[PDB]
Amino acid sequence: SLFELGKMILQETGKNPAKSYGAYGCNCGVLGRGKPKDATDRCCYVHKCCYKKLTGCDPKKDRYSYSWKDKTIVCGENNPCLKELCECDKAVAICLRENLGTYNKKYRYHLKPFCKKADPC
Amino acid sequence: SLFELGKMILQETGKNPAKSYGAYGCNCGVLGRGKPKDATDRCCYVHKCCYKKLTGCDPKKDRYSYSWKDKTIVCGENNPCLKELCECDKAVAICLRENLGTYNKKYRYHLKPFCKKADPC
Ligand SMILES: *CC(=O)c1ccc(Br)cc1
Ligand SMILES: *CC(=O)c1ccc(Br)cc1
Numbered sequence: 001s002l003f004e005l006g007k008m009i010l011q012e013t014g015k016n017p018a019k020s021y022g023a024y025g026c027n028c029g030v031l032g033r034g035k036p037k038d039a040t041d042r043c044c045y046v047h048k049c050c051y052k053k054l055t056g057c058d059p060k061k062d063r064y065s066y067s068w069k070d071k072t073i074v075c076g077e078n079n080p081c082l083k084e085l086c087e088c089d090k091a092v093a094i095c096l097r098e099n100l101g102t103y104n105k106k107y108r109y110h111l112k113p114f115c116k117k118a119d120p121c
Numbered sequence: 122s123l124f125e126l127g128k129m130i131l132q133e134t135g136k137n138p139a140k141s142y143g144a145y146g147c148n149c150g151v152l153g154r155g156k157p158k159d160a161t162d163r164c165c166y167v168h169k170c171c172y173k174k175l176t177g178c179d180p181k182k183d184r185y186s187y188s189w190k191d192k193t194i195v196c197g198e199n200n201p202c203l204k205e206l207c208e209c210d211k212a213v214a215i216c217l218r219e220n221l222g223t224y225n226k227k228y229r230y231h232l233k234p235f236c237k238k239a240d241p242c
Contacts, residue, residue: 016232019144031123061152
């Protein structure tokens with residue numbers, strides 16, 4: 001669920017999720033996958049692809065449990081889809097953090113036209 | 122679609138739609154709707170309800186035609202759902218613009234903290 005996704009991003013990056021990622025490049029935010037602008041955008045690209053692997057669970061709103069253990073994201077079990085949904089979220093949060101160095105604000109506000117077809121996930 | 126929408130919003134309000142509305146209050150932005158925090162938020166509220174009454178087309182992805190004439194959003198003919206969609210969008214753009222004076226960043230990059238809940242659209 002968006003609420004834990006955002007929270008994980010906050011915990012990992014220390015950044016306001018909605019704002020830094022809400023509309024970022026072609027993949028971070030509303031809509032679907034697009035050709036990534038940079039490493040950050042990629043994270044979200046991979047994240048949406050991860051979201052496809054899911055069936056059963058609803059990523060946008062399905063709640064799941066996870067804890068912040070030693071500044072690490074750890075979700076407890078929730079069941080198949082929910083758990084791997086968390087892992088999707090955890091992955092993107094870490095990925096956004098790992099890529100803060102190339103984070104580029106010009107990609108922060110949003111425009112999609114430039115977002116060419118995305119390769120198969 | 123959201124392009125038509127963000128764009129109408131930019132034309133009417135002059136503000137970056139994602140930045141100013143992408144996450145605002147309980148209704149401006151991502152997924153669900155809640156207890157309108159101010160006129161602005163309420164605008165997105167009505168808008169979502171407007172989206173929900175819609176049938177036959179997809180408000181997020183469905184493209185439609187409209188033009189900016191005499192600084193007014195004129196919904197192109199398209200089809201009834203697309204047209205309705207366009208009117209939903211035009212209506213929210215205008216409303217956001219109409220409530221720019223009461224717009225408070227406080228609610229921007231809002232995490233959906235203590236947003237009451239959905240009140241039947
Ligand atoms: C899947 C992903 O990275 C993402 C980022 C921002 C928003 Br809003 C939704 C999804
Ligand atoms: C309905 C509405 O105003 C709105 C604004 C931004 C986003 Br993202 C979605 C919906």
